[PDB]
Amino acid sequence: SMVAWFAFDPGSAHSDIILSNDNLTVTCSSYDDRVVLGKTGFSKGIHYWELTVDRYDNHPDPAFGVARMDVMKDVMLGKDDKAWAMYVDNNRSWFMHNNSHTNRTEGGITKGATIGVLLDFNRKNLTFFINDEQQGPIAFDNVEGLFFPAVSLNRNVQVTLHTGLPVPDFYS
């Protein structure tokens, strides 16, 4: 297929991660944010996938992005130097990498929201979407090497992974 179909990798997950629904749905047992990765790694081309927010209780900062296979699994994505992510609450997002917060953007998530992640190895960049609108500027501009889709979240969030998608501009 022109699109990639994948699920989360149970072998990538922190022990507190709960995978369900053919490894397409994830939550966590802990108040602490924990990581899971996609099973398919990307190193070239352009790839888009989405997360649907099934549950968003209280005001946590789940994170979405890409990571190396050896990213820290027990902390928010982007606390270490092996993930590039957007974290977002009900109000606003930030981008994070190496414990550096950048490009705060107004607008957040709620139950039913969609988060899109556009990983572009030809432009070496990473762009985020919320509800089919670009969230902030291009987040990062030195994308290279092998990356896996990545999520971090805690017990206040559940998300479902949607793959088999083309790039956001594919139609119309």
Numbering used by the authors: 533 to 704
The authors write:
The tripartite motif (TRIM) proteins form one of the largest subfamilies of RING-type E3 ubiquitin ligases, comprising more than 80 members. TRIM family members typically contain a RING domain usually catalyzing ubiquitin transfer; one or two B-box domains mediating protein–protein interactions; and a large coiled-coil domain region, which is involved in self-association or oligomerization with other TRIM E3-ligase proteins. About two-thirds of human TRIM proteins feature a PRYSPRY domain, also known as the B30.2 domain, in their C-terminal region. All characterized family members shared the same overall PRYSPRY twisted β-sandwich fold consisting of a 7-stranded and a 6-stranded antiparallel β-sheet.
There are significant variations in the length, conformation, and amino acid composition of the loops connecting the β-strands. For example, we observed a unique 11-residue deletion between β-strands 2 and 3 in the phylogenetically more closely related family members TRIM9 and TRIM67. Compared with the recently determined structures of TRIM7 PRYSPRY with a peptide substrate or a peptidomimetic ligand, the putative substrate-binding site in the structure of the two phylogenetically closely related family members TRIM9 and TRIM67 was much shallower. This was largely, but not only, due to a distinct orientation of the β5/β6 loop. In TRIM9, this methionine, Met608, packs against Tyr619 on β-strand 6. The equivalent interacting residues in TRIM67 exemplifying this loop collapse are Met680 and Tyr691. That this was seen in both the TRIM9 and TRIM67 structures suggests it is an intrinsic property of this loop in these two closely related homologs, rather than being induced by crystal packing. In summary, our structural data provide a platform for future drug discovery efforts but, importantly, also hint at significant challenges in developing potent small-molecule binders targeting the canonical binding site, especially in cases of particularly shallow surfaces and those partly or largely occluded by either loop collapse (TRIM9/67) or dimerization (TRIM36).
